[PDB]
Design a protein around this ligand. Structure first.
Ligand SMILES: OC[C@H]1O[C@H](O[C@H]2[C@H](O)[C@@H](O)[C@@H](O)O[C@@H]2CO)[C@H](O)[C@@H](O)[C@@H]1O
Ligand code: CA
Length: 836
């Protein structure tokens, strides 16, 4: 499992994982950072599953073709090699790892299949696939076969199938892409028929896989196999006398292998992204690093110039490059896994007899066309999102303070706890993060299963089904309003509210929500949560003037719905009115809303007049007897002062102190009465001043001239001279501390952490360990600060083992930060109101 301060690496079991581990030993020897190499089964399928929760390795190795889908899913960090490092590698290897313009992985080596032949059995291997039956019959007379290779994977078989005219890919525009038109042409039919015939005529067996083919060739049973450079080591060991040469032709045309770049990507979930970078750039991608790996299992033609210059003298590498020259470079588009499913199913089915050759190819063609239309749909919607986001970001640059902190969907768990939950547990301390603006995106309803699981609302099963793939729920479903109906045509939901009444219809049946809520009337209707056929319907339905939402009961009052759909339902009276004084919508374009965050807001002012209390929305110049209703979100008010800034046009003309608040619990707020006298002005800002975090780090910090992690600036024990570049939007006298934050989960259901009945409750504990700087005088714009500082040993790890004590096997630690934090008296805008 991933941990701060060490590296986990995944690579396939056919590559040089033991040599890679030797690189990792050198790293640890120079660096103190332990590196673990693993080769899980089906790693290319496991990765997107586990990385979607925030698990998986720090670094994943695979051929470049899968990485686009990973990147599109947010699973990969953009890598940041400088031009000097890029120049060390062959320039066009970088194109394999570039996706929508960005570099998403490091290229390591170019791979292609070759024909490998036993020179004692077959000094003159056939050029042609056509020669293979007659050759096999002849060798069968002395107990040998002509050719064995992996028939289970289309990486190996498709080159035959596409040989007779056919590119599997097309340059479509800007990019190599999957070819849909003419997948089942006469050339492909001829290739796959040829293969099926080799099987039916008993020159090959449909069950032959990678292990069977390898053991056969390496024990001298078969004169030929097809494989990549990685296979050469086990051949050398077996002492077979072998050559590597050009793939056979079919119908006079080359067998065009797939050309893959073995590539190293950094998991977005990694808190070790700088370490991963150092390992890959300065340890792996060096002559010594690649040599260690290559000496375990050969890499092929490596991306690193200096080392490839040695390798290209080997005739086996020359043969590999000759096949790669004739091959098809794989796209890295997201539809690549669906392509491979299609083409994998086709060969298996045709080879096993499950389908005729033409039915096999027809269904592949239909799958590939379906995948392409989905890609075209997505790209249209990703453009839509692109531009809404772009307006919202432009608006933020133009209209918010320069060093303002903004977020959007370790911290992921805490965002999720805010978004997926309701009431007291959802009051997360965003001010700790110096959060200023929260962006919400209405379309994240489609991502709500992950958000709900990560925020502890639902179980692993509800999130994405159990082992078999059963039990997933739909957490949120939007229902646009068309007259007196709310409809989701896709999901076949119709809600009719005509005739002052509600009828819910899903497909053909009438369904009875557990509850319906109406906003803004606040009417509610309790129902059974079932459909008329007797099946469960565990959903709540909320209707608003413009939209409806169907929500799974466990997220029926999620704060996301409050913020994105304007549904104020809460299990805590008061909660929603409070929330909206802490999140103020200051802009909205497309389906993006930007909220101004303040931990301290006023959601109601009452004024006493003629002796009766009445809520007011503005205030005139003069005297008022007032009662302010305050929301504290996620942290307490402590030793605060309350002011009114009288405002004219955009200028503070007076500061008027109206109250002191020594304490207010964030879960138990109470009204404050004040009597005030206001001068003339266009408007009045209510402003709270108390201690809190200020400043934004500009570059990574340095300890003793060394570049360090802003989230883990010092290990426990360590000390040093520290230097920080800090931005502030105004001047401050600040203290500086080291502050640790622990984010962890606690299992609250299920028998163990692997049970699909498990849900996990996130928690964040923040504490200030040491004051390392007093009265530092920060000035508007940029600043350099330098102090000596030590993090005592025991601080981290002491807490870590107290968590153990309290939670045992329920505990899962997700992040531990040690951060430098400035603290000063800071202003919080609680509410601005007009004069008149
Ligand atoms: O067969 C489909 C499969 O082909 C490629 O995987 C190769 C891999 O690139 C090679 O490094 C080698 O290990 O053999 C694998 C095939 O068994 C694609 O890279 C992969 O996405 C795809 O599923
Ligand atoms: Ca509160």
């Amino acid at each position: 499992k991933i941990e701060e301060g060490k590296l986990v690496i995944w690579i396939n079991g056919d590559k040089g994982y033991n040599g890679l581990a030797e690189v990792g030993k050198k790293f640890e020897k120079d660096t103190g950072i332990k590196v673990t190499v693993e080769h899980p089964d089906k790693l290319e399928e496991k990765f997107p599953q586990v990385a979607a929760t925030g698990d998986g390795p720090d670094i994943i190795f695979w051929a470049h073709d899968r990485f686009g889908g990973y990147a599109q899913s947010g699973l990969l960090a953009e890598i940041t090699p400088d031009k000097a490092f890029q120049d060390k590698l062959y320039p066009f290897t970088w194109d394999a790892v570039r996706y929508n313009g960005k570099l998403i992985a490091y290229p390591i080596a170019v791979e292609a299949l070759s024909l490998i032949y036993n020179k004692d059995l077959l000094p003159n291997p056939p050029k042609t696939w056509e020669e293979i039956p007659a050759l096999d019959k002849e060798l069968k007379a002395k107990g040998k076969s002509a050719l064995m290779f992996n028939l289970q994977e289309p990486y190996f078989t498709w080159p035959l199938i596409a040989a007779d005219g056919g590119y599997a890919f097309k340059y479509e525009n800007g990019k190599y892409d999957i070819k849909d038109v003419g997948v089942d042409n006469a050339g492909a039919k001829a290739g796959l028929t040829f293969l099926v015939d080799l099987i039916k005529n008993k020159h090959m067996n449909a069950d032959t896989d990678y292990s069977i083919a390898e053991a056969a060739f390496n024990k001298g049973e078969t004169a030929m196999t097809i494989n990549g450079p990685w296979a050469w080591s086990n051949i050398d060991t077996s002492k077979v006398n072998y050559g590597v040469t050009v793939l056979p032709t079919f119908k006079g045309q080359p067998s065009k292998p797939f050309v893959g770049v073995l590539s190293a990507g950094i998991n977005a979930a990694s808190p070790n992204k700088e370490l991963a970078k150092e390992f890959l750039e300065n340890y792996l991608l060096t002559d010594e690093g690649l040599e260690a790996v290559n000496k375990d299992k050969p890499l092929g033609a490596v991306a690193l110039k200096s080392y490839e210059e040695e390798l290209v003298k080997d005739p086996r590498i020359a043969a590999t490059m000759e096949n790669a020259q004739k091959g098809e470079i794989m796209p890295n588009i997201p539809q690549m896994s669906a392509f491979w499913y299609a083409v994998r199913t086709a060969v298996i089915n045709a080879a096993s007899g499950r389908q005729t050759v033409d039915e096999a190819l027809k269904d592949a063609q239909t799958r590939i066309a379906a995948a392409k239309a989905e890609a075209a749909a997505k790209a249209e919607a990703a453009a839509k999102a692109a531009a809404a986001w772009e307006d919202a970001l432009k608006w933020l640059r133009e209209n918010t303070p320069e060093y303002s902190t903004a977020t959007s969907w370790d911290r992921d768990h805490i965002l999720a706890l805010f978004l997926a939950r309701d009431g007291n547990i959802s009051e997360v301390d965003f001010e700790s993060w110096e959060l200023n603006y929260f962006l919400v995106y209405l379309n994240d309803w489609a991502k709500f299963n992950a958000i709900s699981y990560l925020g502890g609302a639902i179980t692993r099963r509800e999130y994405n089904g159990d082992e078999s793939g059963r039990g997933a729920v739909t957490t949120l479903l939007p229902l646009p309003r068309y007259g007196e109906k709310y409809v989701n045509l896709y999901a076949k939901v119709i809600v009719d509210v005509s005739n002052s009444s509600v009828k819910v219809t899903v497909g053909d049946r009438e369904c009875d929500p557990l509850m319906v809520t109406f906003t803004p009337s606040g009417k509610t209707i309790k129902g059974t949560g079932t459909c008329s056929d007797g099946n469960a319907f565990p959903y709540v339905l909320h209707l608003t003037p413009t939209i409806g939402v169907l929500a799974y009961y466990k997220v029926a009052t999620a704060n996301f719905i409050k913020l994105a759909f304007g549904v104020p339902a809460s299990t805590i009276p008061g909660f929603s009115d409070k929330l909206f004084s802490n999140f103020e919508p200051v802009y909205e374009s497309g389906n993006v809303i930007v909220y101004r965050f303040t931990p301290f807001g006023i959601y109601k002012i009452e004024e006493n007049i003629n002796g009766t209390w009445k809520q007011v929305y503005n205030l005139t110049p003069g005297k008022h007897e007032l009662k302010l209703y305050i929301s504290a979100f996620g942290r307490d008010i402590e030793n605060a002062t309350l002011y009114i800034y009288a405002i004219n046009n955009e200028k503070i003309i007076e500061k008027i102190k109206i109250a002191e608040i020594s304490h207010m619990d964030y879960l138990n707020e109470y009204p404050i009465a004040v009597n005030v006298t206001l001068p003339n002005a266009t408007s009045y800002r209510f402003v709270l001043v108390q201690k809190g975090p200020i400043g934004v780090l500009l570059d990574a910090p340095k300890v003793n001239g060394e570049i360090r992690s802003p989230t883990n600036i010092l290990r426990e024990g360590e000390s040093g001279e520290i230097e920080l570049k800090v931005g502030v939007d105004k001047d401050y006298t600040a203290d500086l501390y080291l502050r640790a934050t622990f984010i962890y989960l606690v299992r609250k259901s299920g028998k163990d952490n692997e049970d699909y009945d498990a849900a996990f409750e996130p928690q964040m504990d923040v504490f200030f360990i040491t004051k390392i700087g007093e009265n530092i005088q920060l000035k508007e714009g940029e600043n350099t600060v330098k102090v000596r500082a030590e993090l005592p040993e025991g601080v981290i790890s002491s807490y870590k083992d107290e968590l153990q004590r309290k939670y045992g096997d329920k505990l899962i630690i997700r992040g531990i930060r040690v951060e430098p934090v400035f603290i000063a008296e800071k202003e919080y805008l609680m509410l601005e109101v007009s004069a008149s």
